[PDB]
Design an enzyme around this catalytic site. Structure first.
Site, PDB file in Angstrom:
ATOM      1  N   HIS A 213     -18.085  -1.954   5.707  1.00 35.36           N
ATOM      2  CA  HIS A 213     -16.688  -2.391   5.560  1.00 35.36           C
ATOM      3  C   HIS A 213     -16.292  -3.426   6.612  1.00 35.36           C
ATOM      4  O   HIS A 213     -15.611  -4.421   6.303  1.00 35.36           O
ATOM      5  CB  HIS A 213     -15.731  -1.189   5.557  1.00 35.36           C
ATOM      6  CG  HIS A 213     -14.407  -1.480   4.921  1.00 35.36           C
ATOM      7  ND1 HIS A 213     -13.316  -0.650   5.061  1.00 35.36           N
ATOM      8  CD2 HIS A 213     -13.996  -2.515   4.146  1.00 35.36           C
ATOM      9  CE1 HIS A 213     -12.290  -1.157   4.397  1.00 35.36           C
ATOM     10  NE2 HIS A 213     -12.675  -2.294   3.841  1.00 35.36           N
TER      11      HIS A 213
ATOM     12  N   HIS B 284     -15.485  -7.669   5.899  1.00 40.06           N
ATOM     13  CA  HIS B 284     -14.252  -8.315   6.359  1.00 40.06           C
ATOM     14  C   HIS B 284     -14.522  -9.403   7.399  1.00 40.06           C
ATOM     15  O   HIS B 284     -13.698 -10.309   7.569  1.00 40.06           O
ATOM     16  CB  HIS B 284     -13.220  -7.281   6.851  1.00 40.06           C
ATOM     17  CG  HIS B 284     -12.459  -6.611   5.744  1.00 40.06           C
ATOM     18  ND1 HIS B 284     -11.254  -7.089   5.274  1.00 40.06           N
ATOM     19  CD2 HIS B 284     -12.744  -5.517   4.996  1.00 40.06           C
ATOM     20  CE1 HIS B 284     -10.819  -6.314   4.296  1.00 40.06           C
ATOM     21  NE2 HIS B 284     -11.708  -5.351   4.103  1.00 40.06           N
TER      22      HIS B 284
ATOM     23  N   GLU C 198     -15.032   4.728   3.410  1.00 43.99           N
ATOM     24  CA  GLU C 198     -13.764   3.969   3.420  1.00 43.99           C
ATOM     25  C   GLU C 198     -13.577   3.254   2.086  1.00 43.99           C
ATOM     26  O   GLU C 198     -14.531   2.680   1.536  1.00 43.99           O
ATOM     27  CB  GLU C 198     -13.790   2.950   4.568  1.00 43.99           C
ATOM     28  CG  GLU C 198     -13.862   3.608   5.958  1.00 43.99           C
ATOM     29  CD  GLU C 198     -13.860   2.664   7.140  1.00 43.99           C
ATOM     30  OE1 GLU C 198     -13.795   1.419   6.979  1.00 43.99           O
ATOM     31  OE2 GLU C 198     -13.941   3.160   8.283  1.00 43.99           O
TER      32      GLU C 198
ATOM     33  N   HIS D  43     -12.189   0.191  -0.138  1.00 45.82           N
ATOM     34  CA  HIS D  43     -12.081  -1.248   0.103  1.00 45.82           C
ATOM     35  C   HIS D  43     -11.558  -1.938  -1.141  1.00 45.82           C
ATOM     36  O   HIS D  43     -11.907  -1.571  -2.251  1.00 45.82           O
ATOM     37  CB  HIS D  43     -13.474  -1.793   0.501  1.00 45.82           C
ATOM     38  CG  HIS D  43     -13.622  -3.296   0.445  1.00 45.82           C
ATOM     39  ND1 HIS D  43     -12.964  -4.162   1.305  1.00 45.82           N
ATOM     40  CD2 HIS D  43     -14.420  -4.078  -0.326  1.00 45.82           C
ATOM     41  CE1 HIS D  43     -13.321  -5.409   1.037  1.00 45.82           C
ATOM     42  NE2 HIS D  43     -14.201  -5.387   0.048  1.00 45.82           N
ATOM     43  N   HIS D  44     -10.669  -2.915  -0.952  1.00 47.70           N
ATOM     44  CA  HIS D  44     -10.205  -3.753  -2.069  1.00 47.70           C
ATOM     45  C   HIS D  44     -11.023  -5.048  -2.141  1.00 47.70           C
ATOM     46  O   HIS D  44     -11.111  -5.815  -1.147  1.00 47.70           O
ATOM     47  CB  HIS D  44      -8.702  -4.038  -1.942  1.00 47.70           C
ATOM     48  CG  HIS D  44      -7.860  -2.812  -2.161  1.00 47.70           C
ATOM     49  ND1 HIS D  44      -7.460  -1.975  -1.134  1.00 47.70           N
ATOM     50  CD2 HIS D  44      -7.368  -2.275  -3.302  1.00 47.70           C
ATOM     51  CE1 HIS D  44      -6.741  -0.985  -1.640  1.00 47.70           C
ATOM     52  NE2 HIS D  44      -6.673  -1.139  -2.948  1.00 47.70           N
TER      53      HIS D  44
ATOM     54  N   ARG E   5     -14.877   5.848  13.399  1.00 47.15           N
ATOM     55  CA  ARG E   5     -14.940   5.698  11.946  1.00 47.15           C
ATOM     56  C   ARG E   5     -16.280   6.239  11.449  1.00 47.15           C
ATOM     57  O   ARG E   5     -17.323   5.573  11.609  1.00 47.15           O
ATOM     58  CB  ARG E   5     -14.780   4.230  11.551  1.00 47.15           C
ATOM     59  CG  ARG E   5     -13.405   3.632  11.897  1.00 47.15           C
ATOM     60  CD  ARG E   5     -13.428   2.115  11.975  1.00 47.15           C
ATOM     61  NE  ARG E   5     -13.519   1.528  10.645  1.00 47.15           N
ATOM     62  CZ  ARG E   5     -13.230   0.259  10.381  1.00 47.15           C
ATOM     63  NH1 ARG E   5     -12.831  -0.544  11.364  1.00 47.15           N
ATOM     64  NH2 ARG E   5     -13.323  -0.204   9.142  1.00 47.15           N
TER      65      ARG E   5
ATOM     66  N   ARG F  96       0.815  -1.231   0.000  1.00 41.43           N
ATOM     67  CA  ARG F  96       0.000   0.000   0.000  1.00 41.43           C
ATOM     68  C   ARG F  96       0.844   1.275   0.000  1.00 41.43           C
ATOM     69  O   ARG F  96       0.315   2.366  -0.251  1.00 41.43           O
ATOM     70  CB  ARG F  96      -0.933   0.046   1.202  1.00 41.43           C
ATOM     71  CG  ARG F  96      -2.162  -0.788   1.056  1.00 41.43           C
ATOM     72  CD  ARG F  96      -3.179  -0.583   2.158  1.00 41.43           C
ATOM     73  NE  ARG F  96      -4.207  -1.627   2.134  1.00 41.43           N
ATOM     74  CZ  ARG F  96      -4.071  -2.832   2.693  1.00 41.43           C
ATOM     75  NH1 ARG F  96      -2.947  -3.162   3.324  1.00 41.43           N
ATOM     76  NH2 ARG F  96      -5.059  -3.717   2.613  1.00 41.43           N
TER      77      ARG F  96
HETATM   78 ZN   LIG Z   1     -11.622  -3.734   2.803  1.00 39.65          ZN
END
Ligand SMILES: [Zn+2]
EC number: 3.1.-.-
Lengths: 130, 83
Positions: A124, A128, A97, A99-100, A93, A2
């Protein structure tokens, strides 16, 4: 990975006014095609630098920015992520966001916009989870 | 000084809301800290929605937001601004 330089790639998808509503559902919202057109082939030092560029481009886009209120427009103009509705926030948060979709841990591409999604904090965390 | 609504004059609270609405910070972190502070101060059930997702009809200028907070606290048994 990253924090290694890369050029942005990929096409994104057509979006409408409900673009950020989609960030709270399923795999999140796509990167808009119009944004991908502006960012493709630009080099970024880190993923954080890419994230800043995404929100700056949103601020400048007349179709995307119209669906943010004045205070959220001010935020994106600084390159910050805009605030989500309250019930999609989780603790500290409070903003959208990136996200991949295919995880970076698994060789997912860092800067391919077809591998990136916009999510709320709540969504998000849930994606996950497992 | 900034522990509760009652520590702020109305003018000082308007300054805070104005800074948030204009995102007049040096980082996203700084802005999130201020919004969290606003939520804790007002105790309004809408939280950050007062700033970013106003109810139809509400004035979401900094002055509008301050008046929404002032009126809600007055109507719901809460203490008000200093002077
Ligand atoms: Zn993510």
């Amino acid at each position: 990975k990253r924090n290694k330089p890369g050029k942005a790639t990929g096409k994104g998808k057509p979006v409408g006014d409900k673009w950020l509503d989609d960030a709270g559902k399923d795999s999140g919202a796509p990167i808009p095609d119009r944004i991908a057109d502006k960012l493709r082939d630009k080099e970024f030092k880190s993923f954080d630098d890419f994230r800043k560029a995404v929100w700056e481009e949103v601020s400048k886009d007349p179709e995307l920015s119209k669906n943010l209120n004045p205070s959220n427009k001010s935020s994106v103009s600084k390159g910050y992520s805009p605030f989500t509705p309250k019930n999609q926030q989780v603790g500290g948060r409070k903003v959208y966001e990136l996200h991949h979709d295919k995880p970076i841990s698994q060789g997912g591409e860092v800067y391919d916009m077809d591998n990136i999604r916009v999510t709320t904090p709540k969504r998000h965390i849930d994606i996950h989870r497992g | 000084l900034k522990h509760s609504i009652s520590d702020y004059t109305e003018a000082e609270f308007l300054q805070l809301v104005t800074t948030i609405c204009n995102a007049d910070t040096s980082s996203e972190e700084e802005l999130v800290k201020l919004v969290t502070h606003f939520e804790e101060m007002t105790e309004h059930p809408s939280g950050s929605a007062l700033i970013y997702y106003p109810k139809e009809g509400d004035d979401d200028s900094p002055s509008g937001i301050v008046n929404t907070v002032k009126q809600w606290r007055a109507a719901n048994g809460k203490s008000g601004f200093k002077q």
